[PDB]
From a paper:
The genomes of most C. perfringens strains contain three separate genes encoding highly conserved GH33 CAZymes targeting sialic acid glycosidic linkages: the nonsecreted 43 kDa [name], and the two secreted 77 kDa NanI and 129 kDa NanJ. Here, we present the structural and biochemical characterization of the GH33 catalytic domains of the three sialidases of C. perfringens and probe their substrate specificity. The catalytically active domains, which we refer to as NanHGH33, NanJGH33, and NanIGH33, displayed differential activity on various naturally occurring forms of sialic acid. We report the X-ray crystal structures of these domains in complex with relevant sialic acid variants revealing the molecular basis of how each catalytic domain accommodates different sialic acids.
[name] consists solely of the catalytic GH33 domain. The structures of NanHGH33 and NanJGH33 display the characteristic 6-bladed β-propeller fold seen in exo-acting [name] GH33 domains. The inserted domain is not present in NanHGH33 and the RMSD of NanHGH33 with the other two structures is 1.7 Å. NanHGH33, however, has a considerably different organization in the active site region that interacts with the glycerol moiety, suggesting this may contribute to the ability of this enzyme to recognize additional acetylated variants of sialic acid. The most notable difference in [name] is in the loop structures surrounding the active site. In NanHGH33 loops on 3-blades forming the rim of one side of the cavity are extended, thus deepening the active site. The center blade of the three has a solvent exposed tyrosine residue, Y310, that projects into the active site. In contrast, [name] is predicted to be localized to the cytoplasm of the bacterium (i.e. it lacks any obvious export signals), suggesting it does not interact directly with the host. The biological role of [name] is more likely in processing glycans that are imported with their terminal sialic acids intact.
Numbering used by the authors: 20 to 382
The structure:
């Protein structure tokens, strides 16, 4: 597989890369992102977000820093954990978490984390240039319905979606002060004005849920989320754009994730030529357990043939993850093409999976 971001040969002399992201553009351009983890694998470190862009279907790549941290702390300033979407205008939005101090974003403080913010950039030239950073949390003018007991929140790490009428929906994760503890939950945020302003949904039914993505299905939102220490990815459905949730049985509990903590993965919808809507999920099998996160696999469900069990399509990364930080992945599906980016021993690798989609599509 192509090494897209190479810890042993990159223009930033970065020691590590983590948290990859991919969008297949309507015109065939491939846009990807990654944390530039300059000094090593740690989350609590100095990080910027790179882009890598290809106009020859992944043969060659042009690299850039898509978003810089706040440059306040040479050890801890970081923007990281990209969540992206392409809107119906073709605008590309990236939302990242921003901090500049040591300590887990959700658990370190009992009040709103003072160095925390959510930063947005967008591109109206298909990822060639980016806006200035837009701070979504410094005031109350950009995001509605943020809870007063928020410790912090960020995107779900992956891709958002667009509803039938153009509404943008982004997966998110939040930490909330509740009865003298901090509990973290998945949720969504949505924008009806091309990302200028947002409204936050309500938390899903279970805590210990974090990184996630949602698909749209007949107006409903279906979320596949990391559910820590359950052994599986939870799934929930919302019929009111994320105000209420219930368990979605056909996917809940069906993708197992091994012993220990959960892991980020991706979840997207494709419509095959027979009209069926299928869900594709990427995540480590983690048969070896905890943070080994071996065998990043791709799974399929057919929402129009739900008695057929979830199927393992392929394993793009049939290797142990690096315990320092590995296992994350991102699928993108567009115009009958399917691509993946994933963590691979401190690098990011890229693969075109379109031949597997052809097998599924049965033309």
């Amino acid at each position: 597989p192509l090494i897209l971001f190479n810890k042993d040969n990159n223009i930033w002399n970065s020691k590590y890369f983590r948290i990859p992201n991919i969008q297949l553009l309507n015109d065939g351009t491939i846009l990807t992102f990654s944390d530039i983890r300059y000094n090593g694998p740690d989350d609590h470190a100095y990080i910027d977000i790179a882009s890598a862009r290809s106009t020859d279907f992944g043969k060659t790549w042009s690299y850039d820093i898509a978003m810089k941290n706040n440059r306040i702390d040479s050890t801890y300033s970081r923007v990281m954990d990209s969540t992206t979407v392409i809107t119906n205008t073709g605008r590309i939005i990236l939302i990242a978490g921003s901090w500049n101090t040591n300590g887990n974003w959700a658990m370190t403080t009992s009040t709103r984390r003072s160095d925390w913010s959510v930063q947005m950039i967008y591109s109206d030239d298909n990822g060639l240039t980016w806006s200035n950073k837009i701070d979504l949390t410094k005031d109350s003018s950009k995001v509605k319905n943020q809870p007063s007991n928020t410790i912090g929140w960020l995107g779900g790490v992956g891709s958002g979606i667009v509803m039938d009428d153009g509404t943008i929906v982004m997966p998110a994760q939040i930490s909330l002060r509740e009865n003298n503890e901090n509990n973290y939950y998945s949720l969504i945020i949505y924008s009806k004005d091309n990302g200028e302003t947002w409204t936050m949904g309500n938390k899903v039914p279970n805590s210990n849920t974090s990184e996630n993505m949602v698909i749209e299905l007949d107006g409903a939102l279906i979320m596949s989320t990391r559910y820590d220490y359950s052994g599986y990815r939870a799934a929930y459905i919302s019929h009111d754009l994320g105000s209420t949730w219930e368990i979605y049985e056909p996917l809940n509990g069906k993708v197992l994730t091994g012993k220990g903590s959960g892991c980020q993965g991706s979840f997207i919808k494709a419509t095959t030529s027979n009209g069926h809507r299928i869900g594709l999920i990427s995540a480590p099998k983690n048969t070896k357990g905890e943070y080994i996160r071996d065998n990043i696999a791709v799974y399929m469900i057919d929402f129009d043939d739900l008695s057929k069990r979830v199927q393992e399509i392929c394993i793009p990364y049939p290797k142990d993850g690096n315990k320092l930080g590995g296992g994350y992945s991102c699928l993108s599906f567009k115009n009958s093409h399917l691509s993946i980016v994933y963590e691979a021993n401190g690098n990011i690798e890229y693969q075109d999976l379109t031949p597997y989609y052809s097998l599924i599509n049965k033309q």
